[PDB]
Design a protein around this ligand. Structure first.
Ligand code: 508
Length: 373
């Protein structure tokens, strides 16, 4: 394929995020940068920090322009602060272009950088609406599309377990997937917001009002590890997953992520755990499709023992389809056509009895009733 040089341009550690090399300034300064479809700022470590091997040195970059305004990104659960500027940015294993992008130079942070993650910054790939300090700060990808002829599309193949993957910028690599691509509309351009219309555990409908699946939003977020579900959905899903996997018993805290369970090397009974199906709104009236994930996806590896964390968790800010979901699939962020495509990944981690799937079409009525207003 023509996109060959962008294949396998992602690295990472399990549960710690996928990152791509980005080259900033003049002369060149290359950093490892977290690929995050759940935020909208391009920001880099710019001062020494215990968890950073390298950082951005603005004084050494002749093309760096100070924007003379501070920037702060808040969280649950930590934060970072820095200075706004612009500089020249290229992706050596991405598109053959160089753009002047907004860059936040991180000078202080709390619980942002992860010990041993090997990334030194973050690439916010979502829309300007959620950018800090506000929506006037053009996100990187917006700059890329405005300044170059790179098509308004990227795609992600995240390969789970030391992890790897591909970010194809400007197109779709057909070697990265099998079968067909199925598209769900981007409801609104802020986060990558989608609509979930039905949930099944081992083919059994969870039978909740579909509004609950998308309260108060459902997003596709490459920077979040887990499948995160609204409290009511989480509880019903856990109750159903428990009942489906009853050939073995697990402590209550396992389902809450407070306890881990370990198996002797290569003896994890994947077969005892159910498959989970998320149905997404399709592109045609009353039409949906489903993506199916294996226990290999939602049980994350954390001696001769393999330890696993239950990687479905509770959320009070909507559903978050994180890496747990994305790792089964080749995921197309077709910004040009306001839609997200899903196909079975060529690097899909499966066993000999079951496989991750993207299947359709299905008939689902009143799907418009499922969205939060
Ligand atoms: O939710 C996120 C991202 C979205 N995907 C992964 C995320 C979610 C899970 C946590 C996390 C951790 C590291 C990197 C990414 C992410 N944010 C970016 C960084 C985050 C932050 C975290 C810790 C300290 C300071 C800032 C603030 C937030 C944010 C997003 C959008 C607007 C404002 C803030």
């Amino acid at each position: 394929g023509s996109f060959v040089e962008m294949v396998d341009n992602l690295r990472g550690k399990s549960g710690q995020g996928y990152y791509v090399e980005m080259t900033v300034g003049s002369p060149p300064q290359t950093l490892n940068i977290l690929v995050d479809t759940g935020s909208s700022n391009f920001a880099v470590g710019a001062a020494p920090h215990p968890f950073l091997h390298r950082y951005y040195q603005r004084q050494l970059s002749s093309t760096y322009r100070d924007l003379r305004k501070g920037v702060y990104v808040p969280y649950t659960q930590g934060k970072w602060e820095g200075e706004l500027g612009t500089d020249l940015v290229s992706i050596p294993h991405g598109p053959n272009v160089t753009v002047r992008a907004n860059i936040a130079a991180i000078t202080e942070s709390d619980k942002f950088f992860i010990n041993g993650s090997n990334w030194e910054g973050i690439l916010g790939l979502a829309y300007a609406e959620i950018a800090r300090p506000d929506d006037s700060l053009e996100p990187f990808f917006d700059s890329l599309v405005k300044q170059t002829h790179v098509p308004n599309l990227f795609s992600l193949q995240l390969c789970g377990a030391s992890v790897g993957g591909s970010m194809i910028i400007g197109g779709i690599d057909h070697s990265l997937y099998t079968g067909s691509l199925w598209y769900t509309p981007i409801r609104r351009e802020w986060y990558y917001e989608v609509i979930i219309v039905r949930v099944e555990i081992n083919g059994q409908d969870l039978k909740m009002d579909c509004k609950e699946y998308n309260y108060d939003k459902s997003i596709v977020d490459s920077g979040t590890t887990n499948l995160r579900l609204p409290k009511k959905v989480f509880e019903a899903a856990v109750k159903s997953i428990k009942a489906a996997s009853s050939t073995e018993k697990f402590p209550d805290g396992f389902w809450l992520g407070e306890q881990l369970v370990c198996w002797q090397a290569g003896t994890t009974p994947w077969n005892i755990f159910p498959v989970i199906s998320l149905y997404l709104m399709g592109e045609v009236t009353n039409q949906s499709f489903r993506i199916t994930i294996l226990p290999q996806q939602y049980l994350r590896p954390v001696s001769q023992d393999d330890c696993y964390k239950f990687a479905i968790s509770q959320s009070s800010t909507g559903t978050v389809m994180g890496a747990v979901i994305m790792e089964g699939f080749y995921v197309v962020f077709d910004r040009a056509r306001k839609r997200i495509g899903f196909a079975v990944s060529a690097c899909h981690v499966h066993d000999e009895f079951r496989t991750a799937a993207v299947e359709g079409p299905f008939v689902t009525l009143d799907m418009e009733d499922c969205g939060y207003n």
